[PDB]
Amino acid sequence: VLSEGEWQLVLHVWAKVEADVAGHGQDILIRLFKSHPETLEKFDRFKHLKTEAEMKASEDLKKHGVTVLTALGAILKKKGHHEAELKPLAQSHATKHKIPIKYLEFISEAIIHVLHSRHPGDFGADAQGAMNKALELFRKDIAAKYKELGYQG
Numbered sequence: 751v752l753s754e755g756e757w758q759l760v761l762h763v764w765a766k767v768e769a770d771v772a773g774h775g776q777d778i779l780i781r782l783f784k785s786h787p788e789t790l791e792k793f794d795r796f797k798h799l800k801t802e803a804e805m806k807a808s809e810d811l812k813k814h815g816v817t818v819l820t821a822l823g824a825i826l827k828k829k830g831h832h833e834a835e836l837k838p839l840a841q842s843h844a845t846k847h848k849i850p851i852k853y854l855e856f857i858s859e860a861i862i863h864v865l866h867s868r869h870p871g872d873f874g875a876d877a878q879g880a881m882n883k884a885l886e887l888f889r890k891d892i893a894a895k896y897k898e899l900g901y902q903g
């Protein structure tokens with residue numbers, strides 16, 4: 751359970767992200783795909799992209815980055831009271847998209863890295879630890895839904 755102070759650190763940096771949702775979403779998906787190429791393979795929509803320059807030039811990838819970060823921002827702003835938001839997301843990601851929980855760990859790393867690069871003054875160690883806790887809570891709660899459905903592994 752995050753404390754109120756931890757949530758304030760999370761949402762203070764997240765308010766900075768929302769000034770350029772699309773640039774953050776590009777940076778995060780590109781980092782995810784470069785660091786963990788198995789993740790790119792899960793996207794029929796993107797797996798034609800073979801270089802970082804091609805990824806940066808894809809408007810559709812930029813659009814999807816906004817979709818992803820909008821869903822995550824709505825979850826973070828619930829401060830843990832996010833059951834209604836996680837139900838459909840766990841269902842799609844477990845049963846339709848077939849995304850292992852481990853790949854959610856990978857995107858969480860990519861998010862933390864990009865936030866550190868773009869917002870160092872608001873993303874010191876205290877805020878890094880709080881965002882790590884928030885993303886752990888996200889993964890814990892999604893993993894419980896995966897397990898219900900027979901996909902935790």
Ligand code: HEM
Binds near residue numbers: 821839
């Ligand atoms: C912070 C974590 C993530 C969030 C908030 C998120 C959110 C979303 C949302 C909102 C959609 C569209 C609605 C839906 O299908 O449920 C979507 C689609 C999708 N997501 Fe995620 N996602 C996350 C992580 C991942 C990861 C790590 C992968 C793959 C490694 C992935 C793969 C996909 C795929 C394949 C689609 C469908 C894309 C398409 O063909 O339109 N997601 N995601």
